[PDB]
C-alpha cells in the first residue's frame, strides 16, 4: 500500500524505491525498483484504470490565486471548458482554435478555473499585452499587482494572466528555457504547478522540447491554430503537453449573420515558353521563383484581382517571399506590407485598406502570422503553395475573411484562392491541402481553365515581355 | 380545503391539531397540464446570480426581460406575466410609460398598477377576452399578490 | 349532387403570420395549395354553384377573384396569389362588408356562405364588428373560420353567431379534412 512510498529525481528520470509494482512499465531494469522518464508522469490513466493512486509528500503549503469572476465565451468554447472539467489531467492537454476568435480568453479562463500557481508561456510581448487587456476583469486591484516577467525585469504575484514569460534561449536572460529548473512543478522542484502555453506548436522543436521534457509538470494546457509545420511533429505533442481535447469550430456552425461561408479554390495554371527549360534544368532555391512568377499564373492572379475590385471586394494577397511580394505588387501598383515597412506606414496602409473605398487590394509577407492584427477582407489569394504549413493557410484564412454585406447568410460570401503552376513540385502540396480543408469542413474545388482570360487586357502579352522577366529571374 | 393540499403537513403545523384527512374528488390525467421552469440554455448565460435581484440590472435585461420577449413573441397566445413587485414589473417592461429610458422589453402589453378601480379592471379583462395578446389575464403584467388573483 | 345552388366567399389571411414555416414550406404555400384542391372538389360535388375570393393583407381587403360559376378563375387566382405572398395584419370587417354586398343580392333558395382561413389574433378595422355580425345573421350570411393554432374570442363568436363552424387546424392532413368537410352541400 503506498502510505510509505518514496519517489525521486535523477538528471531527467524518476526512480521509485520499495515499489507497489505499478502497471504498464519494465521491472528490475537495473535494480529492484521502477524507473521512468519525468515526462511519463502525464500517463495518470494507466494507474487510474488499474485503480492505483499516489501522494505528494514533497508539497509546499503557501498561498494561491482565486480569480472568482467569470465571463462568457463562444458556444463551442464554453462546451470545451465544460469538457475539461469532465475529462481531468488523465485525459486532457491541448485545445485547437483560430488566432482571431477568443484564444486569449480561453487561457485566462483555463487558469481562473484550474486555479493553481501558474506560469504562462507565450511567443511575443504584443500577445502578452493583448492577454493583459483580456485579463483586466480578473486582475487583483486593477493595475497594482499586474507585472511583466522577461529579459529586462520581473515583479508581483500576477500579470498577463499569472506570471508570463517567453520560450526564448539566446542567453541567461531569455525567460522559460533558462529558468526551467528553478521554480515550476508542485511534485518536485515544487514552487508552482500549472503550465499554460499559448501558440503551443512552438515548443516540440528539437532544442525547445527539452523545456517540457526535463520536469514531471503536473497540469499542462496548450492553445493553437497552426498546430504543426509541414513535417508534422504532432505525435510528440500528446506526450509533451497532453492529448487533444478539442478541434473543430467549423464555419458550418456559424453562418446566418455570424462569420462567413468561404468558397475555397485551388487554381491549376499552365506553364508558358522558356520558364520550364529553366525550371527543369535548375535544381537550386531560385526554381521556387520560376513557378511563382510564371506569367500565365500571374495573369490568373491579375484577372482575379480585377474581377473582385470590379465588385468592390476587399482583397489581401499573400506572397511568401519579399522578392515575389515586390515583383507582383509593383507591377499591380497595390501597396505592400512586410518587415522593413515601418509601423507608421503600415498603420496608414491598413487604415486606408479598412476605411477607404479606393484602397481594396494589399500584398503581405510572412509577418502576418504569429502575433499580428491582420485586417478584415472578403478575398484571400496565395501566389504559391509555400512551405509554412497547410494548417497555417487555414488559420490565416479564418482570421482574415468575413461575409460581404447583404449576403451574410448565403452558401458563400467570401473567397479563398491558391495558385499552382502545372508540371512542377508546387503541385505536390495539393492532395494534402485538399484533404485537410475538407476534413476542416470547408467547401473546396479545383479550377483548371479560365477562357475569359482570353477576352481582356492583362500582362505578358508577348514572348518578348515574358523574356524580359525570364532574364531578370534567372540572374 | 384549498383545492390541492396533498403533502398535508402545513395545515396540522398551523393548527397544532390533527384533523381527519381525506381526498374527495376524482382527478384527470397530468397531460392536460404543463408546469415549466426557465433559467438559461448555454454555459455563457451567467446573468441570474440573484445575490441582489432588486439591483442586478444585467440580470433583469438578460433572460428576465429577453426570455419573456422570446416566449411571448413565439407563443402568441393570451398570457399574463406575474411579478414579485411593481418595481420589478416597471423595470422589466419599458411599456409606453418607462421608469427609465434604459429598460429592455418592446412589445404591446397592458399594465395593472395600483389604484386599480373595479370598473377599470373589467375594461382590461374585456380587452383580453375579446382579441389580441393584451388585456387583464392576456399579455399584461400584474404583481402576483394583486387583485388579478380574483380572476374572472 | 344536385338540389340547390351555393354562393361561397373564400377569405384568406395574408398577414405576416401566414409566412411562418410551421405548416409546410410556410402557411401561405400550404393553405393556397390545398385551397386549389378544395375548389375543384367543391365545384365537382356542387356543379350549380358560385365562389368569390378575398384576401386580408397589409391592414386591407383585396378581391383575388370575382363571384362566378367557372372553377378555373379561382384555381388561376390561387396560383397567382402565391408569388405576391403575405405581410402585415388582417382587415376582416371590410372583407365581411364586400362579401355581404355580393351575398345580399342572391335569391331566396341559394345558400349565403363565407369560409375564412385565419392565422392572426385580432383585426385592424376601427368599425364595430358586433353590429356587422348581427346584420350577417339577419341577412342569412353564414361564416365559418378554420384557425391555425388559435381561439381568440371575437372570431369564434363571430363564426357561432352566424351559424356554428369555428374549427382548429394543426396539420396539412387536418386542413384537407376540414376543407373536404366544407365541400359537403347543405339540405334542401
Q: Could you say which DSSP state residue A10 is in?
A: E
- Taking an 8 Å cut-off on Cβ atoms, the answer to whether C121 and B130 are in contact is no
Angle at CA A362, nearest 5°, toward A359 and A367? 140
Q: Which of B41, B43, B47, B66 is best to mutate for the A interface (most A CBs within 10 A)?
A: B43
State the nearest Cα–Cα gap between B131 and chain C, in angstroms.
5
**Residue of A221, A218, A219, A201 lying closest to A110 (CA atoms):** A221
Q: Which helix (H) or strand (E) holds A219?
A: strand A219-224
- C-alpha grid cell for residue B77? 397566445
**Residue of C90, C93, C74 lying closest to C143 (CA atoms):** C93
Half-sphere exposure for A370 (CA within 13 Å, toward CB): 13
| Residue indicated by cell numbers 502555453 | A197
Q: Name the residue facing B46 among A70, A79, A82 (closest C-beta).
A: A70
Contacts of C154 in chain B (CB under 8 A): 130-131
Burial class (CB in 10 A: 0-12, 13-18, 19+), A306: middle
Q: Between chain A and chain B, how many beta carbons pairs sit less than 8 Å apart? A: 14
Q: In what order do the strands lie in the sheet with A8-10?
A: A8-10, A13-16, A34-37
DSSP 3-state of A266: strand
Q: Which of A69, A72, A82 is best to mutate for the B interface (most B CBs within 10 A)?
A: A72
Partner residues linked to A246 by β-bridges: A95
| Residue indicated by cell numbers 376524482 | B26
| Residue indicated by cell numbers 525567460 | A175
Q: In what order do the strands lie in the sheet with A219-224?
A: A163-166, A118-122, A194-198, A219-224, A94-96, A244-247
Q: Using CA atoms, how far apart are residues A330 and A327, in angstroms rounded to an integer? A: 6
Q: Where are the beta strands (DSSP E) in chain B?
A: 80-83, 140-143
Q: Using CA atoms, how far apart are residues B63 and B42, in angstroms rounded to an integer? A: 12
Question: Residue A393 phi/psi, 5° resolution?
Answer: -60, -45
- Taking an 8 Å cut-off on Cβ atoms, the answer to whether A81 and B43 are in contact is yes
- Taking an 8 Å cut-off on Cβ atoms, the answer to whether B129 and C122 are in contact is no
Q: Please give the span between the terminal C-alpha atoms of chain A, in angstroms, as a whole number.
A: 75
Chain B touches chain A, with at least 3 Cβ pairs below 8 Å, answer yes
Q: Using CA atoms, how far apart are residues A423 and A326, in angstroms rounded to an integer? A: 25
Q: Which helix (H) or strand (E) holds A166?
A: strand A163-166
Half-sphere exposure for C74 (CA within 13 Å, toward CB): 27
CA A102 vs. chain centroid, Å, equals 13
- The answer to whether residue C123 neighbours chain B at the CB level (below 8 Å) is yes
Angle at CA B45, nearest 5°, toward B43 and B49? 115
Q: Using CA atoms, how far apart are residues C9 and C182, in angstroms rounded to an integer? A: 12
Nominal resolution (angstroms): 7.2
Contacts of A70 in chain B (CB under 8 A): 46
Which residues, 6 or more positions from A162, have their beta carbon under 8 angstroms from its beta carbon? A65, A111, A117, A118, A119, A120, A194, A196
- Taking an 8 Å cut-off on Cβ atoms, the answer to whether A82 and B46 are in contact is no
Q: Name the residue facing C154 among B76, B131, B133 (closest C-beta).
A: B131
Q: Using CA atoms, how far apart are residues C180 and C176, in angstroms rounded to an integer? A: 6
Q: Where are the beta strands (DSSP E) in C20-163?
A: 49-57, 60-68, 113-118, 142-148
Q: Using CA atoms, how far apart are residues A279 and A283, in angstroms rounded to an integer? A: 8
**Residue of C9, C5, C3, C14 lying closest to C144 (CA atoms):** C9
Say if residues A272 and A294 touch (Cβ distance below 8 Å). Answer: yes
State the nearest Cα–Cα gap between B56 and chain C, in angstroms.
35
DSSP 3-state of A43: coil
Burial class (CB in 10 A: 0-12, 13-18, 19+), B56: middle
Burial class (CB in 10 A: 0-12, 13-18, 19+), B119: exposed
Q: Using CA atoms, how far apart are residues A292 and A314, in angstroms rounded to an integer? A: 23
Which residues, 6 or more positions from A31, have their beta carbon under 8 angstroms from its beta carbon? none
Q: Could you say which DSSP state residue B39 is in?
A: -
| Residue indicated by cell numbers 363564426 | C159
- Taking an 8 Å cut-off on Cβ atoms, the answer to whether B76 and C121 are in contact is yes
Task: Kindly provide the b/e burial profile for residues C78-100, where b requires at least 16 CB atoms within 10 angstroms of the residue's own CB.
Answer: beebeeeebeebbbbbbbbebbb
- C-alpha grid cell for residue B136? 387583464
- Cβ neighbour number for residue A369 with a 10 Å cutoff: 19
**Chains with at least 3 CB pairs less than 8 angstroms from chain C:** B
Q: CA torsion angle for A244, A245, A251, A253 (degrees, to 10)?
A: 160
Say if residues A221 and A94 touch (Cβ distance below 8 Å). Answer: yes
- Taking an 8 Å cut-off on Cβ atoms, the answer to whether C123 and B131 are in contact is yes
Structure solved using which method? Answer: cryo-EM
**Chains with at least 3 CB pairs less than 8 angstroms from chain B:** A, C
Question: A282: left (phi > 0), else alpha (psi -120 to 50), else beta?
Answer: beta
Q: In what order do the strands lie in the sheet with A361-364?
A: A336-337, A361-364, A315-318, A379-382, A414-421, A262-269, A443-447
Angle at CA B66, nearest 5°, toward C26 and B82? 105
- C-alpha grid cell for residue A312? 468592390
Which residues, 6 or more positions from C100, have their beta carbon under 8 angstroms from its beta carbon? C132, C135, C136, C139, C141
Q: Using CA atoms, how far apart are residues C136 and A243, in angstroms rounded to an integer? A: 77
Contacts of B130 in chain C (CB under 8 A): 152-154
Burial class (CB in 10 A: 0-12, 13-18, 19+), B33: exposed
Q: Using CA atoms, how far apart are residues B41 and A78, in angstroms rounded to an integer? A: 12
State the nearest Cα–Cα gap between C153 and chain B, in angstroms.
5
Q: Using CA atoms, how far apart are residues A65 and A145, in angstroms rounded to an integer? A: 12
- Cβ neighbour number for residue A346 with a 10 Å cutoff: 17
Amino acid at each position: 500500500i503506498p502510505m510509505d512510498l518514496f519517489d525521486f529525481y535523477e538528471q531527467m528520470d524518476k526512480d521509485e524505491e520499495e515499489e507497489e509494482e505499478t502497471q504498464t512499465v519494465s521491472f528490475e531494469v537495473k535494480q529492484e525498483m521502477i524507473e521512468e522518464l519525468q515526462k511519463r508522469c502525464i500517463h495518470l490513466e494507466y494507474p487510474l484504470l488499474a485503480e492505483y493512486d499516489f501522494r505528494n509528500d514533497s508539497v509546499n503549503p503557501d498561498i494561491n490565486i482565486d480569480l472568482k469572476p467569470t465571463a462568457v465565451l463562444r458556444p463551442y468554447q464554453e462546451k470545451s471548458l465544460r469538457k475539461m472539467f469532465g475529462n481531468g489531467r488523465a485525459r486532457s492537454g491541448v485545445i485547437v482554435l483560430p488566432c482571431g476568435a477568443g484564444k486569449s480568453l480561453v487561457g485566462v479562463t483555463a487558469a481562473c478555473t484550474v486555479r493553481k500557481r501558474c506560469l504562462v508561456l507565450g511567443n511575443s510581448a504584443v500577445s502578452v499585452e493583448q492577454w493583459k487587456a483580456q485579463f483586466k476583469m480578473w486582475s487583483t486591484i486593477d493595475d497594482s499587482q499586474i507585472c511583466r516577467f522577461t529579459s529586462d525585469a520581473k515583479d508581483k504575484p500576477i500579470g498577463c494572466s499569472v506570471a508570463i514569460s517567453t520560450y526564448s534561449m539566446l542567453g541567461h536572460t531569455t525567460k522559460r528555457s533558462w529558468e526551467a529548473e528553478r521554480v515550476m512543478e508542485w511534485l518536485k522542484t515544487q514552487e508552482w504547478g500549472l503550465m499554460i502555453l499559448d501558440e503551443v506548436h512552438t515548443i516540440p522543436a528539437k532544442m525547445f522540447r527539452r523545456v517540457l521534457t526535463i520536469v514531471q509538470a503536473h497540469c499542462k494546457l496548450g492553445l493553437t491554430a497552426t498546430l504543426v509545420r509541414e513535417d508534422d511533429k504532432i505525435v510528440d505533442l500528446n506526450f509533451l503537453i497532453g492529448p487533444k481535447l478539442y478541434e473543430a469550430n467549423w464555419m458550418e456552425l456559424q453562418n446566418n449573420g455570424y462569420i462567413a461561408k468561404v468558397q475555397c479554390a485551388e487554381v491549376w495554371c499552365p506553364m508558358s515558353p522558356e520558364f520550364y527549360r529553366e525550371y527543369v534544368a535548375i535544381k537550386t532555391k531560385k526554381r521556387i521563383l520560376l513557378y511563382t512568377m510564371n506569367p500565365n499564373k500571374f495573369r490568373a492572379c491579375q484577372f482575379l484581382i480585377k474581377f473582385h475590385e470590379r465588385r468592390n471586394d476587399k482583397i489581401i494577397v499573400f506572397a511568401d517571399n519579399v522578392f515575389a511580394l515586390k515583383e507582383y505588387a509593383i507591377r499591380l501598383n497595390k501597396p505592400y506590407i512586410y518587415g522593413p515597412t515601418s509601423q507608421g506606414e503600415r498603420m496608414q496602409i491598413l487604415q486606408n485598406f479598412k476605411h477607404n473605398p479606393k484602397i481594396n487590394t494589399i500584398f503581405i509577407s510572412k509577418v502576418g502570422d504569429t502575433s499580428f492584427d491582420l485586417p478584415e477582407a472578403n478575398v484571400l489569394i496565395q501566389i504559391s503553395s509555400h512551405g509554412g504549413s497547410r494548417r497555417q493557410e487555414a488559420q490565416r484564412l479564418g482570421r482574415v475573411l468575413r461575409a460581404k454585406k447583404g449576403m451574410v447568410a448565403e452558401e458563400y460570401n467570401a473567397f479563398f484562392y491558391s495558385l499552382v503552376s502545372q508540371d512542377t513540385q508546387e503541385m505536390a502540396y495539393s492532395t494534402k491541402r485538399q484533404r485537410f480543408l475538407v476534413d476542416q469542413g470547408y467547401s473546396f474545388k479545383v479550377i483548371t481553365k479560365l477562357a475569359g482570360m482570353e477576352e481582356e487586357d492583362l500582362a505578358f502579352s508577348t514572348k518578348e515581355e515574358q523574356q524580359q522577366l525570364l532574364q531578370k529571374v534567372l540572374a | 380545503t384549498s383545492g390541492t393540499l396533498s403533502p398535508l403537513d402545513i395545515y396540522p403545523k398551523i393548527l397544532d391539531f390533527h384533523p381527519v384527512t381525506m381526498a374527495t374528488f376524482t382527478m384527470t390525467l397530468a397531460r392536460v397540464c404543463l408546469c415549466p421552469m426557465i433559467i438559461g440554455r448555454g454555459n455563457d448565460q451567467v446573468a441570474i446570480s440573484s445575490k441582489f435581484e432588486t439591483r442586478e440590472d444585467i440580470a433583469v435585461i438578460r433572460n428576465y426581460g429577453n426570455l419573456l420577449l422570446e416566449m411571448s413573441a413565439v407563443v402568441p397566445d393570451g398570457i399574463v406575466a406575474f411579478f414579485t413587485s411593481y418595481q420589478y414589473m416597471e423595470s422589466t417592461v419599458a411599456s409606453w410609460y418607462e421608469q427609465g429610458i434604459l429598460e429592455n422589453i418592446q412589445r404591446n402589453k397592458l399594465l395593472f398598477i395600483e389604484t386599480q378601480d373595479g370598473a377599470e379592471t373589467s375594461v382590461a379583462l374585456e380587452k383580453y377576452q375579446e382579441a389580441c395578446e393584451n388585456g387583464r389575464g392576456a399579455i399584461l403584467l400584474s404583481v402576483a399578490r394583486g387583485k388579478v388573483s380574483e380572476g374572472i | 349532387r344536385l338540389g340547390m345552388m351555393r354562393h361561397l366567399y373564400v377569405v384568406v389571411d395574408g398577414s405576416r403570420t401566414m409566412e411562418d414555416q410551421d405548416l409546410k414550406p410556410n402557411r401561405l404555400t400550404c393553405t393556397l395549395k390545398l385551397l386549389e384542391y378544395f375548389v375543384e372538389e367543391y365545384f365537382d360535388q356542387n356543379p350549380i354553384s358560385q365562389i368569390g375570393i378575398i384576401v386580408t393583407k397589409s391592414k386591407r381587403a383585396e378581391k383575388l377573384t370575382e363571384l362566378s360559376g367557372n372553377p378555373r378563375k379561382h384555381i388561376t387566382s390561387l396560383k397567382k396569389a402565391v408569388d405576391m405572398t403575405c405581410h402585415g395584419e388582417p382587415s376582416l370587417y371590410n372583407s365581411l362588408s364586400i362579401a355581404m354586398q355580393t351575398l345580399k343580392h342572391m335569391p331566396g333558395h341559394t345558400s349565403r356562405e363565407v369560409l375564412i382561413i385565419f392565422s392572426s389574433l385580432t383585426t385592424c378595422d376601427p368599425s364595430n364588428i358586433y353590429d356587422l355580425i348581427k346584420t350577417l345573421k339577419a341577412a342569412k350570411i353564414r361564416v365559418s373560420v378554420i384557425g391555425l393554432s388559435a381561439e381568440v374570442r371575437v372570431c369564434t363568436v363571430l363564426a357561432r353567431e352566424t351559424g356554428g363552424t369555428y374549427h382548429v387546424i394543426l396539420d396539412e392532413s387536418h386542413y384537407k379534412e376540414l376543407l373536404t368537410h366544407h365541400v359537403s352541400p347543405p339540405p334542401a
